Symmetry: C2
Subunit: 124 residues, 2 copies
């Protein structure tokens, strides 16, 4: 019973994610370092938790300062890098060289599994 005028922006969530990706790439305002085959990746724990049940479990209730997470040897840079890029851009690209590793990393880090999707194109 109060008059209201509401705006829903179709660009805002995309624009926030673009800004979070720029922070990640330029290593500013991030708060977690992920070690993958010993190589350093920077991210925001809030975004990793939103995007991966594996990371969420390693992030709940941790200390307030910089956090370090080491992923085990099952996770390669080849399979992980396309996925952190999907988390921050909404776009996932798989190459002939990395498709197997990425599929393995999706299953390892998330509740999803893309093997059966990729399998549908095996014959043509």
């Amino acid at each position: 019973s109060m008059s209201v005028f509401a705006y829903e922006s179709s660009v805002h969530s995309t624009n926030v994610l673009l800004s979070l990706n720029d922070q990640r790439k330029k290593d500013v305002l991030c708060d977690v370092t992920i070690f993958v085959e010993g190589q350093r990746f920077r991210a925001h724990r809030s975004v990793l938790a939103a995007c991966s049940s594996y990371f969420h479990s390693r992030i709940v209730g941790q200390a307030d300062g910089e956090l370090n997470i080491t992923l085990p040897e099952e996770v390669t840079v080849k399979g992980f890098e396309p996925l952190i890029q999907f988390a921050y851009t909404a776009k996932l690209i798989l190459s002939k060289e990395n498709v197997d590793e990425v599929c393995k990393c999706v299953e390892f880090l998330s509740v999803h599994n893309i093997e059966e999707s990729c399998f549908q194109f095996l014959k043509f």
Copy 2:
């Protein structure tokens, strides 16, 4: 690119999760005091959305950050904007329109002309 997937919902889903964290006060890293009332957020999101906050966030220490907004900023005007930041929806009302318009200017590079919404007061 043997396979390429583009998700039209992913950015919305990440923002939904950030909003849930904000409201439940988990995985946040900045407190904002507005008329003394406590709000929680992620400095990364505030810096992405507000030039005022960005200037008060970059280069600060890694631990918890605390920002006190001055008396110019009212809860009435600020709360609809933090809600827009975290949800992409801005609700203007008869009661809040002038204050929200003032806080937009105060906090960001944008402007909303209050004169264009005075019909909310009819």
